[PDB]
Structure 1
C-alpha cells in the first residue's frame, strides 16, 4: 500500500535522525569504553551481574536494521549502557566515571532529539 510506504519513509527518516544522535553520543565517549560488548572471554562472570548487556556497536546493528521504532526504544538502550556500567564498576573507577560523563553530556543531545522527533513528527 501507499500507507505502508509512507510509514516506511518515516521509519527511514527516524533512522537517519537516530544515526546522527548515535554519532553525537558516541563522540562523548572518546576513550571508547562503551564502543563494543564487554568481552565474556575477559569478564567471564559478566552475565551473572548484568542481565541485559549493551554497547554502541550493538545499538548500531539494531539501528541499521531499522530496529528502533521510536526514540524511547533508542534511549532505553543508551540508558542500559550507562546503568550496566554504574552497577558493575565501583564509583572510584575510570569506567564508572566515564559513564557519568556520558550520561551528563548525552542529556543535552537527547533533549533536542526529543524536540526534533516531536516537531518533525
Structure 2
C-alpha cells in the first residue's frame, strides 16, 4: 500500500461513503448467482469492494475517476431496480448522503 496525501484522502472518503451504507448492500458486487439477468442491463457493475481494490492497486489517479465509480454504484442500482424497492430507496439515500461526503472531500483534493 503506497502512501500519498491523495491516496489517504481517498481511503478516508471511501470509508465515509461505506458508513452511509448502513445495510452493507453496496459492500460487494451484486451477486450474479442470485440475479442471472443483471449483466443484461448493467454494463459496468460497481461496489465498494471493487472500489477499494482499485484504490489499493493505485488505479484512481484523480478524484474524478473515484467519484465516477461511486456514481455507478448509485446509478446502476436506480437503473436495475423498481422505484418501490428497498434497494432503490437505499440508492437515493446514498446519493444524497454520499454527495455531501464527496463535496467536502473534493474540496480537500483540489488543494493538493
The answer for the alignment partner of 1:19 in structure 2 is 11
Partner Cα separation in structure 2 for residue 28 and residue 95 of structure 1: 14
2:97 paired with 1:105:
yes
The answer for the alignment partner of 2:87 in structure 1 is 95
Out of 63, 66, 69, which is 2:61 matched to?
Answer: 69
What TM-score do you get using the length of structure 2 for normalisation? 0.95
Q: CA RMSD in A?
A: 1.2
Partner Cα separation in structure 2 for residue 78 and residue 104 of structure 1: 12
More helix by share: 1
* Residue-by-residue CA offset, 1:61-109 (whole Å, 9 max, x unaligned): 0000111000000000000000000000011000000000001001111
What TM-score do you get using the length of structure 1 for normalisation? 0.88
Offset at 1:39? 1.1
Partner Cα separation in structure 2 for residue 31 and residue 64 of structure 1: 24
Out of 44, 47, 50, which is 1:58 matched to?
Answer: 50
Offset at 1:13? 2.1
Residues paired across the two proteins, number: 111
2:29 paired with 1:37:
yes
Which ranges in structure 1 are unaligned for 5 or more consecutive residues? 1-7
Max Rg structure: 1
Extract structure 1 runs of 4+ deviating beyond 4 A.
none
